[PDB]
Amino acid sequence: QFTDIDKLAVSTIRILAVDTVSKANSGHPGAPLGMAPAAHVLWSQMRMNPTNPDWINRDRFVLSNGHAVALLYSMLHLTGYDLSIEDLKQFRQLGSRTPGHPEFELPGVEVTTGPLGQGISNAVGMAMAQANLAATYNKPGFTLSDNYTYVFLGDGCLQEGISSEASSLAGHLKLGNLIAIYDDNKITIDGATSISFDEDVAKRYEAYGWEVLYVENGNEDLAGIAKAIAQAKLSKDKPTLIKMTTTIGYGSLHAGSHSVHGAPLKADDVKQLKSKFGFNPDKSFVVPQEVYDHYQKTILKPGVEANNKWNKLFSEYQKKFPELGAELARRLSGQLPANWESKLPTYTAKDSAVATRKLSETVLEDVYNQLPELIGGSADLTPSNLTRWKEALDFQPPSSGSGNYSGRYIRYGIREHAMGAIMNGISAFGANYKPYGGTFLNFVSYAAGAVRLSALSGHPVIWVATHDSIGVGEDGPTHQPIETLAHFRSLPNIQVWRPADGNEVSAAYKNSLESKHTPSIIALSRQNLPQLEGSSIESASKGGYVLQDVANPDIILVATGSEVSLSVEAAKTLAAKNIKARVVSLPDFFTFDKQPLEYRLSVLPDNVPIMSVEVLATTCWGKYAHQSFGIDRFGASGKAPEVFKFFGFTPEGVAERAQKTIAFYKGDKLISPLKKAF
Amino acid sequence: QFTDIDKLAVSTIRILAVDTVSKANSGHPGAPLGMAPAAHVLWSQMRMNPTNPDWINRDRFVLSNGHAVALLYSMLHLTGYDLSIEDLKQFRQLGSRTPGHPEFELPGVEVTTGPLGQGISNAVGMAMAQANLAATYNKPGFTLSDNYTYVFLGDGCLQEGISSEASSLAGHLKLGNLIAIYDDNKITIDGATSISFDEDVAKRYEAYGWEVLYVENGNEDLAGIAKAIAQAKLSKDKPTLIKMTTTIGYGSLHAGSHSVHGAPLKADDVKQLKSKFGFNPDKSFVVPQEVYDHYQKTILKPGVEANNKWNKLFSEYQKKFPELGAELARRLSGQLPANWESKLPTYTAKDSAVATRKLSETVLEDVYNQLPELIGGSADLTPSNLTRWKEALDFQPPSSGSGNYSGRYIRYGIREHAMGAIMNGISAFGANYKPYGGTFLNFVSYAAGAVRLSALSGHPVIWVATHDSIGVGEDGPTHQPIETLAHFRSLPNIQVWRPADGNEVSAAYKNSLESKHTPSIIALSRQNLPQLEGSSIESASKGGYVLQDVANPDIILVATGSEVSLSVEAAKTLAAKNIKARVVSLPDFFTFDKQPLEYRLSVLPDNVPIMSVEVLATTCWGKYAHQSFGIDRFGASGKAPEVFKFFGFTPEGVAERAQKTIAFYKGDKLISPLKKAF
Ligand SMILES: Cc1cc(N)c(C[n+]2csc(CCOP(=O)(O)OP(=O)([O-])O)c2C)cn1
Ligand SMILES: Cc1cc(N)c(C[n+]2csc(CCOP(=O)(O)OP(=O)([O-])O)c2C)cn1
Ligand SMILES: [Ca+2]
Ligand SMILES: [Ca+2]
Question: Which residues take part in binding thiamine diphosphate (chains A, B)?
Fold first, then answer.
């Protein structure tokens, strides 16, 4: 039963979201205005503690259409989160806590949203991380895990293929605690949805295995909106999409036009709206005390009792189940196990040539049981990526007979972008989740809308990107990366590790997992590389290091991944002709850059020529090397030795370019590419 | 009526594709072995001329599952395209015309495929381009355009977001002549589909507005296949999917296994099935004369006849409708209207400061009338990208009441990756189709899959990417690009234009439209920007040119887009403190690198410090400058002028940095970054 106050609370939500777009004189007013009744209804039955945004068993809410953020900040403020009328009064302004799109980093904001289709896929990830936490820790007597994931979305989310990718996997996985409400407002920026989008969302969703409930009058039916979510909570075997019809910009004079989508309302239109709802038209940012009181009583005071009772059960649990409680309290404290690192593989040069892809499989094989928070998967390339450790159980519904939700290995399908954002949501659940997803380095590019947000929000997810170069061979240029590393190296905040040998793969994993805020891509060879003489975990961990040194080098050859051994061989040729080369192995541009300049300048000093060697785009390399031997045209079908030799990446071919670099600069003093003037 | 030579033809297609894989000792047998019945039936009834692959009214066929190439290469050889047994004997080998994934460049090969979901989405662009051309030029008594677009696709393209995006748009647009045939083989790489893919595909595509037909015995039932293709052609208002079930690896000793997907069949397995199919175990790449003979009568000689009749109808068209005939003939010679460039705008430092986005809108107003083949759109951003001319008509079905199929403005919905692939389809069709579509520069990264293939194939599509930086402002970080141009400047064969003004936008559109092999991205400003005294279409067409010069510069300032203006202001300020700065505008790194070195070196000479100015990542600028002022962190929400000011991008902020560059280097001799050792 809802009452007068529920209706005064919905009016307050509607107008506070309108005073905030108008004062910023920038923003989108229309979806706040029409979704306001369901935000009131939903939020009021979420179990969450506004004083503790981090409580692991809090029901979690995603705004997949994050352009509607004025409603989120209104709810956050009104139900007792740390966001004030003053914060609200500096929406979209430089330096505020109120950006024009939700950012993961604020209290009460789960993920960063605003690219469409990204929120819904993030929330699927979250529903997967819950299902797994429950099956791993919940003991009879101790339901530590059971929260729902609530997602608000629009037409725009539903047109983006990532949502499709995501909803198919979610229907496959039978994720019944994910409840999605969709704003069936019939508008997007260009006009009526019918002008492009006129399909059958409900029949398309039932083909995935989701339940579709409908709310025909989303503008005023609080009781139907409430009944749908009630009913939805019973479909435990299938997720729910609730198709809810609303008028965009409800209450506005131009409500239902695409004009209310993304500009502030006209003064005159905001004044009538206020009167219309019984608010004074000349007063901004007004919150009725009965409203503050309502939410205190219905949401914040219950929630703090809920988080209290959950703690008492968890302290009991740890007495009863010591091992499991210690493990879980560690995941919650965000610690990796003490000296987990010791289980990592070290190698010598007597050991054999292995592609860094097999070596990968062996770190996984040697640390999964160390790290129960590690959950992994492949986008249909498990045999090519070698992402399954042998004793693994698949993350599936128990109904499947292929696994169950205690399993820690997911089969993502040929769905790369969706894997990006599901791992970003699994990471985002907490309980120190460490997701890693495998695919081929060229098709990480299929997942760039997700991969970018891992950097921006700071979600420390791992992509095990095998088949890094023309080493791929016969499959040819549709499958051979050129511009890939160069792209991700231009994106702020992501490690891009291209390990050369066993000990360089173990430093890539060490740094990747110890990371709390920076994603990582590990680019791995298809082909066999030898064990370098000189690589340790410790020096590879500094991101870039001197693998072989000479006193007074004629040249410094800087190389990554498969090209470091070529440089060690090219250096062997050069010595024979009395040129002294130092060989610098540079495994991660990011970690390297984080070293002190004393160290970086010792690796790449002044007065020596530096020529870089890597079989991909040369563009990114001018910040370390003086000359660069790389590949700036697409690849070729051929046996991979034949493809490297075609392009000239042979010992003597590299050596020759080093000799031409020496000759070109002879009698010039040289300044390290590292030294910056401002 | 299918007889015994249809049965001989399906075993020859099968064992020929098997011998090709097994001799390359690399490749995918599975799908060629199961789809070979359907390749036979469909090609037998397709209207095409083997001896002329360019006939505009040819029935087109795309293998979206490009990994089954060997089926396609067998069919092209047998039906009389220029491809031979020796070509086939050189499959997946460096230098051959038979690469491991199909490539646009071969005759018979329509677009390159091998990334999943791309071939099917191209087919939709191709089907639109049929629809459009038929609506433009067909007259009563002159059906010059009436062909079908057939696709073959697997479960993996049905798992990719892009094909959902494209199918949703193809259903809305009602493209009844687009027939897709799904290889329902229950396998993919990891294993069976139930493991990840278990949705009702049929109910999903019906939800889009597609007609779904079913063939239950795709392994043997040639007549069933034939009847679905027939029923399908009757669907004049619905595109069709034929869900035809096969057995992966059919005929093999490991049929139905997933080890038959992408490895050569074992030697003895190859002998058991040649024997089973009544061929000799110990002979290979064997085509019975009767198959050659069969395809001669069934396909080559009829298609030649039909092409020839097309040519006579077209000569009479040119008599009857002389001006429309004239036009289609120009397009089919691939010529652009003589002296079209005259309608391109020019400005002087007199004219108002306009956003590059509005100047773009203006080039569209002046050229669409000149260029009948310019068909454009937006992925739900028409009022933001300003991509529609005022006298336009939307590309939509007759029934819509909102446009028709002769319309030249597509409403794509929020479907960026689909729009880039559909655009490749439109372009790849022929008749000088010049496609474009806009979005925000940041979300072109969502189409990165389709965009790489524009470059690999050479489909000269144009991206209109407005909102090129932090100049966006209050939407903030999720919408401001940092990495985007750096990435796309790392990719071979794509022009990444970033005009500073009127004249620079016109240079961008003429080079972009004159292009026959390179796609483009034009990065356009939201904010107003001043016309520059010195810019000219002639100069900006060279990709980089001296905009302001001095006799003996203390420093050269190289900027792009909105920072060229900033750099002129910085130059006034430096002049006052007596530093002489030459300011260089570099609108496209590509077009600039295409210049004679001799020219480039006059723009960027040795022995002057060069410093680059741009509000995006510095990592690509190492190839032209000594120091770089740019932004390598993500942006922020605030009034745009405050965000520029925040990052130091101010006239006096740029000048101070220019002075420190001068000061840092003073006394050293400096080599221009253009110069290489080898
Ligand atoms: C990937 C992507 C993310 C974006 N934010 C957009 C711009 N954008 C934001 S909302 C929208 C379309 C209208 O979206 P909606 O979900 O229907 O919202 P409503 O409030 O109903 O108008 C567009 C094109 C482009 N591209
Ligand atoms: C974008 C992209 C393109 C690729 N080629 C791959 C690898 N790939 C090729 S086929 C396939 C999985 C099987 O798909 P299918 O169409 O069902 O093929 P079939 O022969 O039926 O097993 C995958 C993962 C991943 N992702
Ligand atoms: Ca909408
Ligand atoms: Ca398959």
Answer: 67, 114-116, 156, 185, 261, 416, 443
- Residue tagged active-site, from A110, A327, A361, A416: A416
Q: Is B476 exposed, middle or buried (0-12, 13-18, 19+ CB in 10 A)?
A: buried
Size of interface A-B (CB pairs under 8 A): 359
Strands A545-548 and A581-585: what pairing?
Answer: antiparallel
Contact B678 A656 (CB under 8 A): yes
Query: How far is the C-alpha of A79 from the C-alpha of A206, rounded, in Å?
Result: 34
Question: Are B161 and A160 in contact (CB < 8 Å)?
Answer: yes
| Gap between the Cα atoms of B54 and A384, Å rounded | 39
Contact present, B437 and B387 (Cβ < 8 Å): yes
Residue A196 Cα distances to A8, A68, A254, A255, B380, angstroms:
37, 22, 22, 21, 9
The phi and psi torsions of A127 (rounded to 5 degrees) equal -55, -35
> Cα separation of B475 and A27, whole Å?
8
Let me know how long chain A is.
Answer: 678
Best residue among B414, B463, B466 to mutate for probing ligand 1's pocket (most ligand atoms within 8 Å of CB) is B414
Q: A115: CA distance to ligand 1 center in Å?
A: 8
- Any catalytic annotation for residue B416? yes
**How many A from CA of A193 to the centre of ligand 3?**
8
Q: Which ligand is nearest to the CA of B379?
A: 1
A337 and A370 in contact (C-beta within 8 Å)?
yes
The CATH fold assigned to A1-329 is: Rossmann fold (3.40.50)
Q: Give the integer Cα–Cα distance in Å for A401 and B415.
A: 37
Resolution in A: 2.7
Kind plus residue range of the DSSP H or E element containing A387? none
Place of tokens 């530096």: A610
Task: Report whether CATH 3.40.50.920 matches the domain B542-678.
Answer: yes
Query: What chain B residue is nearest to A661 in terms of C-alpha separation?
Result: B677
String of DSSP letters for B411-433: E--S-HHHHHHHHHHHHHH-TT-
> What CATH number has the domain spanning A330-541?
3.40.50.970
**Mind telling me how many Å the CA of B292 is from chain A's nearest CA?**
29
Nearest residue, CB atoms, A190 vs list B115, B162, B378: B378
Is A656 in a helix, a strand, or coil?
A: helix
Residue having the nearest C-alpha atom to atom 5 of ligand 2: B115
Please enumerate in sequence order all residues whose Cβ is within 8 A of that of A322, keeping only pairs 6 or more positions apart, or say none.
none
CA of B185 relative to ligand 4 center, distance in Å: 5
Pocket test for ligand 2, best of B62, B69, B116, B157 (most atoms within 8 A of CB): B116
Q: Where are the domains of chain A?
A: 1-329, 330-541, 542-678
DSSP label of A391? T
Which run of H or of E encompasses A385? helix A382-385
SS3 for B218-229 is CCCCHHHHHHHH
Nearest ligand 1 atom to the CA of A160 is 1
Give the strand pairing for A581-585 and B520-524.
Answer: unpaired
**Most B CBs within 10 Å: which of A174, A452, A628, A645, as the mutation test of the B interface?**
A452
Strands B610-613 and A545-548: unpaired
Sign of CA dihedral B40, B46, B52, B53: negative
Q: Which chain A residues contact residue B413 at CB under 8 A?
A: 159, 188, 196-197
Neighbouring residues of B556: CB distance < 8 A, sequence distance ≥ 6: B581, B582, B583, B584, B604, B605, B608, B609, B610, B611
Q: How far is A189 from chain B (nearest CA, A)?
A: 6
Q: Tell me how far CA of residue B490 lies from CA of A416, A620, B377, B486, in angstroms.
A: 22, 8, 26, 6
Number of Cβ within a 10 Å radius of residue B651: 17
Helix (H) and strand (E) counts for chain A?
26, 18
Question: Does B475 carry a binding-site annotation?
Answer: yes
